[PDB]
Structures are given as C-alpha cells and as structure tokens.
Design a protein around this ligand. Structure first.
Ligand SMILES: [Zn+2]
Ligand SMILES: [Zn+2]
Ligand SMILES: [Zn+2]
Lengths: 86, 509, 170
C-alpha cells in the first residue's frame, strides 16, 4: 500500500480563445449555453442571446448573468463588464 | 608641477591686484598656453608613469594643469582608462573556480569603489573620468575569452541565486538589500543583459516553484532594482512571475472554497496546493512532450481543478506541467519509516510498484505512457537513492528491466527527500538558453533593420552596421555574422532586397 | 501555407526559365487565384488562431500569402486589432492603486513596444497594420469604467509629474 499526501503541482495557463466561441461554455456562441443545453425541452431556444460587452466580446446572456452574480469583471479581459448590445 | 601651480597662484593674485578685472582670464590663458601647453608633450609622456604610480597630489596637479590646457586632458583620460582596465583584468582573471560569482562581484565592487573614491577625492569628479571608468569596467567584466564564451551574465545570475536562496550559512535581510544595491552598480555595466535576464528568469523559476526564496519581499526588491536599472520591458516577465507566485495563495484559497461549496463531497484525499503560472512570462516550456499518465488518486484532483479553472476562469487552457510537479508520498507498505518527497514522474512508477511488487519495463510503459529517456532517468534516480533494487544481472537499463522493491531501505531521516535537481544547470539546457537568447537577438536585429529600411529605404552596409550597434547597444553587442544572417532571413521571406546598382545599398520588397 | 510558399517560390523559378519574361506576372497571379485566393474562407477562419497565439512563423506566411490577394489583408487587420485591443486591456488593468501612473504608462508602452517589434519582424511595418495598432491602443488607452469618466489623461498627468518631480530614487 502506497498513500499520496501532497501533490503540489505546476500548471501553465495560456489564452485559448477560439473564434465565435463562448469563453464560459467552450462552445459556439450561436448555440444554446451549456446551462440551457440540458433540459432542452424546457428551454425555448430563444432566450440564449449573444451578449456583447464594450470590449467587443461575446458570451451567452445566461453565462455572463451567472458570471455577474459573483464578480463584475469580464473573464476574457479584466475590465468591468458593460452591456452594449442584446 | 609644484612650481607651476605656485607660480600660477602668484600670477593670479598679481594680476588681480594690478590689472583690470576684465583681463584676469586673458592673463591666465596666456600664462598657461605658453607655460604647460608649450611643454605639453613632456607632460603627456610622463602622464602614463604618473598614473600607473598612482601618486595622489602629483596626479591632482597634473589633472589641474591638463584641464587648463584645451587639448591636454584626453591623453590623461586614455591613460587612466587603460590603467583601470589593466587593474581590473589583473584583479579578475586570477579568480578561481571554487567560488567565482561572489568573489568576482566583490573584486569588481572593490575596484569600482576605490576608483570612485579616488576620482571624487583627488580628481574633482570629472564626468570624462567617470565615463572612462565606466568604459574600463565594461571592458573588465566582459573579459570574453577569444571566440569561446562570455561568463559575466552567468556569473552574475549565479551570484544573485546564491545570495537570494534560503541558505543555512546565514544572511540577514538588510545585508541582502544593501549587497544587492551595491550589486546593481556592477550589473549596470554588462552590455550582455539578455543572457543575464534569461538566466535570472531560470533561477527565479527554480527558486519560486520549489519555494527556496527566503522572503518574497527580497524578490520584489530585486525586481524593482532591476526595473530601475533597465526598464519595465526588462522586468515584465519577472514581475509577472512574482505576481503569479503571490496570487497562487489566493487561487488556492478560492479553489478550497469552491471544493467546500460543491453539492457533493469531492474527497480528494491529498493536501492539494497548486502553483498556476502564466505560460507567456515563465521560462518553463513543454519541451519534454512525452505523454504522462496521472495516477487515479491524483486524476480525481486534476479533473476537479480543471473543472474549477474552466468555471471561475474562462478562455484559459490549462497546460499541465509534470516535470516540475512534486509532492510527498507515504510508504506504509514496508512499515511506514518516513514520508518521501517525490516528483510525479517517480510517483507514477511508485504507484505501479504499489499495484504489484514484480513489475517490468513494459508494465511501466503501459501504466505511465512516458518515453524511454524520462522513464530511465526516474528508474536510475530511484536506484541511485536505493529506493528499488534491480533484479537483473546488470544494474543498468535494459529492454526487459525486471525488478522489485528494495526492503532494505531504513533511512534515518523522517522526511527524506529523494529529489535534488534544484540546481541542475546541464550544459545542454544552458546551450538551449543561449540559442533562445540568440533567437531573441535575431528578432531584435530584424526589427531594427526593417524599421530603418521603412524609414529611409536607402542605406549602405556600414551605416546599417553602425545604427544596429548604436540602437541595440542597451541590449547586447551584435556581430556582423548575426546581422548578415538576419538580412539573409529577410531576403528569404521576400522582405528585404539589395540595390541592383550596388550591393552596398538595399531596397524594399 | 508552408507548402504554398514552396510552390509559389518554385513557380516564380519555373516560369522564369520556361516562359517569356512578359508572362511572369500572369502565371503567378493566376497561381494565387487558384491556391490562396480560392481559400480565403479557410485562411481567414484559421487566421484567428494564428494571431492569438502569436506564432511568428505562421503569421509571416499568412502575411505574404494574403498580401497578394486584394481582400486577404483587411480581415487580418481586423483580427490583429482585436488581438491588440484584447492584449492591451490585460496590461492596463488589474493594477494596484499605489503606483497606477507608472504601471499604466509602462504597460501600454510595453504592449506598444512589443507589438511594434512584432509587426516589423513579421508584417514588415505595413501602414495598414500600423493603423490597426494605433486604432487598437486608442480604445485601450481611452477605456472607461461603467458610468465613469476616462481616466487616461489624469493618469498620464500624474506620471509626467512623478517623472519630473525631485525624486531621490535614481
Ligand atoms: Zn456559454
Ligand atoms: Zn441558456
Ligand atoms: Zn471582455
């Protein structure tokens, strides 16, 4: 029997933005968010609008809505989030 | 000299008490241009002897008289620069290999301090002489052996690493601060700061990841001093490294809060504490592209942390690093003698041993998926620390490699560490660092070349060489071969072209 | 794009020693109209991944290919401008209030310093690209907080004041 106690590891993070992709759901912006991907029968597939910030960044509206409940900073670029489009 | 200064003082008071005030300058000028300027050759001939002898008062009088002469001073400047250069060569090239960085920096500091004191005291602190001293010391610290190496940046980086690492010899914080403040004076003349920057980045990574720093405030002070030495673009990578290592504590706290706020109990079973670093500003790289298999009890934690970093951060792929990864493991299989710190490469084969005492090389290969070189390195490290014993006839690596655990391990240390690759410094990776420095040099030279050509579109070879030397002087000293290779690279990418009328002139594609 | 540049460079050589010198342009131009100008939809789709990861090798090969086609550049101009504007915003923000002026001017200059040093070595200082950089930094310098006023002129005012004041720190 061997038991591991500490695993202090090193992780490298780099920007992985792909074109026309939700940075939170990691899928296409036009499709439903991963929160609304499940229980698609309940979801009307119309409320997942593409919210555009002042930094010309695209998230699903549900995604940025859940994001704003914890922090008021855009995840892609560390600025305060301001809606401009719908 | 004594008679000339005495007679000059007498003539000064004489013309002040006799002539009109408007003629004092003319009387002094004609009392020096026909007194020491006419005999300037003799003074210049005796200048080298009077400088090398380092007689104080005579040198001061000689400096006064040569400052009086319009064209008598530069010869003394050259003599003093040559003397300081020779003194530095004889005070640095005799150093030994037992301790090269510390003693080298100490000798350069002592020579610089003595000469600055002499210049301030018996030379009136002329800026020409200070510039001569700077040029001489620049030639001293860059004592490049012919066409082979340049040991100054490596030595200075090793010096910083030795003084900032948490050592049992004993150095207090304030002594470290004043020693570094004196060190910046030495660093201000390297003319090869790219090599030092890369070596300091490597040593900062080695110090920060393993937690060998004595205090983060010391690292921040050192980085601020480097920033004031060169600029923000010199220390942006280092500052990002230090910022990431500071915010690692907040990230660990956020991860712990996230895994304590989940709907179900994750039960990682390990003391998890991550060191997420920015990929753009750390000198680490995924050069060992060998695929590694995470053990399952760590696979759970890797999956949980991946989900966390995809949730509370966005658009950040998480390139895991394993050859820096390490941690503590327990060994209650043989009676729990102690707890061993171990890298995850060796931890994988340790868990493979935990699966079964009898294990072959093929089983390690299919359980870890890692390449032969890294697996062989881990195996030889384990047998070198006598963690395992080779059951084959020969103890080296072979195709079969059948072996089991060594039950004779009874080390006295209760927290014995089986990894000691904190210094490393293999000549291969140093050559890789040199090659990366050369590539950055080629990028910088190409940037300057294309900028100049876009500015003017017509230059000769000599002017291009001179402007490349001048513009890149704050970074390095480029060679003709490097600039020729860069212009040939721009030729190959159909970006630059020479003039058809003359190969000396160049054009735009 | 590596294999295209191998063919395009060869096609200049092959048409040189085989054809009349008056047809050098027409063969190469129709070469591009079947190899790079017929894959603008493919090249612009993969242009986004090239600029974001700053692959100097592939960005150079994208530039020489897309320079030949008339419409090849204007999508890459918009892509680099979106990258600089993003890369600028990381540098300007997340800055402590103790040293906001010096860190701000350094961060925008560092982004400008690095990207000018990247445009010249890869895009060869194309004035179309330099306008894309200047447009992008104009958005990040004049970036504004929600329901607030732009803090750029006040911040540079303190920086040039801190730099010019009597300071003993070197
Ligand atoms: Zn989404
Ligand atoms: Zn939704
Ligand atoms: Zn954004």
């Amino acid at each position: 029997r061997f038991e591991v106690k500490k695993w202090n590891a090193v992780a490298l993070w780099a920007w992985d933005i792909v074109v026309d992709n939700c940075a939170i759901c990691r899928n296409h912006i036009m499709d439903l968010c991963i929160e609304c991907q499940a229980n698609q029968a309940s979801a009307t597939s119309e409320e997942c609008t593409v919210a555009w910030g002042v930094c010309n960044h695209a998230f699903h509206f549900h995604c940025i809505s859940r994001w704003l409940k914890t922090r008021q900073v855009c995840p892609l670029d560390n600025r305060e989030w301001e809606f401009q489009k719908y | 000299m004594e008679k000339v200064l005495g007679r000059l003082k007498d003539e000064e008071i004489r013309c002040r008490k006799y002539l009109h005030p408007s003629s004092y300058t003319k009387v002094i000028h004609e009392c020096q241009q026909r007194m020491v300027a006419d005999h300037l050759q003799f003074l210049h001939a005796e200048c080298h002897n009077i400088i090398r002898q380092e007689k104080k008062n005579d040198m001061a009088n000689m400096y006064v008289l040569l400052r009086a002469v319009s064209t008598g001073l530069p010869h003394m400047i050259q003599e003093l620069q040559n003397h300081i250069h020779d003194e530095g060569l004889r005070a640095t090239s005799n150093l030994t290999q037992e301790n090269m960085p510390t003693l080298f920096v100490e000798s350069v500091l002592e020579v610089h301090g003595k000469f600055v004191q002499l210049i301030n005291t018996v030379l009136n602190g002329d800026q020409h002489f200070m510039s001569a001293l700077d040029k001489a010391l620049t030639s001293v610290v860059n004592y490049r052996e012919p066409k082979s190496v340049c040991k100054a940046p490596e030595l200075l980086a090793k010096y910083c690493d030795n003084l900032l690492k948490k050592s049992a010899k004993g150095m207090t914080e304030n002594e470290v601060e004043d020693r570094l403040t004196s060190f910046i004076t030495v660093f201000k003349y390297i003319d090869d700061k790219d090599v030092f920057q890369k070596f300091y980045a490597r040593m900062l990574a080695k110090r920060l990841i393993h937690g060998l720093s004595m205090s983060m405030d010391s690292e921040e002070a050192m980085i601020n001093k480097l920033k004031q030495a060169c600029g923000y673009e010199f220390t942006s990578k280092l500052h990002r490294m230090y910022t990431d290592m500071s915010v690692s504590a907040d990230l660990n706290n956020k991860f712990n809060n996230f895994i304590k706020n989940q709907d179900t109990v994750i039960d990682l079973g390990i003391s998890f504490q991550i060191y997420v670093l920015q990929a753009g500003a750390w000198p680490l790289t995924q050069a060992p592209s060998s695929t590694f298999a995470i053990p399952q009890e760590l696979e759970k934690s890797v999956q949980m942390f991946e989900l966390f970093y995809s949730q509370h951060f966005s658009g950040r792929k998480l390139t895991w690093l394993h050859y820096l990864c390490t941690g503590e493991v327990k060994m209650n299989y043989l009676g729990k003698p102690y707890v061993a710190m171990v890298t995850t490469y060796q931890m994988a084969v340790l868990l493979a041993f935990n699966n079964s005492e009898t294990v072959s090389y093929k089983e390690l290969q299919d359980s870890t998926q890692m390449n032969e070189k890294e697996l062989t390195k881990t195996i030889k490290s384990l047998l070198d620390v006598k963690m395992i014993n080779h059951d084959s006839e020969k103890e080296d690596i072979d195709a079969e490699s059948s072996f089991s655990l060594n039950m004779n391990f009874s080390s006295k240390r209760t927290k014995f560490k089986i990894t000691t690759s904190m210094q490393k410094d293999t000549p291969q990776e140093m050559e890789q660092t040199r090659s990366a420095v050369d590539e950055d040099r080629k990028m910088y030279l190409q940037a300057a070349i294309v900028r100049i050509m876009k500015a003017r579109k017509v230059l000769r070879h000599n002017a291009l060489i001179q402007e490349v030397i001048s513009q890149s002087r704050a970074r390095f000293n480029p060679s003709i071969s490097m600039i020729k290779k860069c212009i040939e690279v721009l030729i190959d990418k159909q970006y630059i072209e020479r003039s058809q009328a003359s190969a000396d002139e160049y054009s735009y594609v």
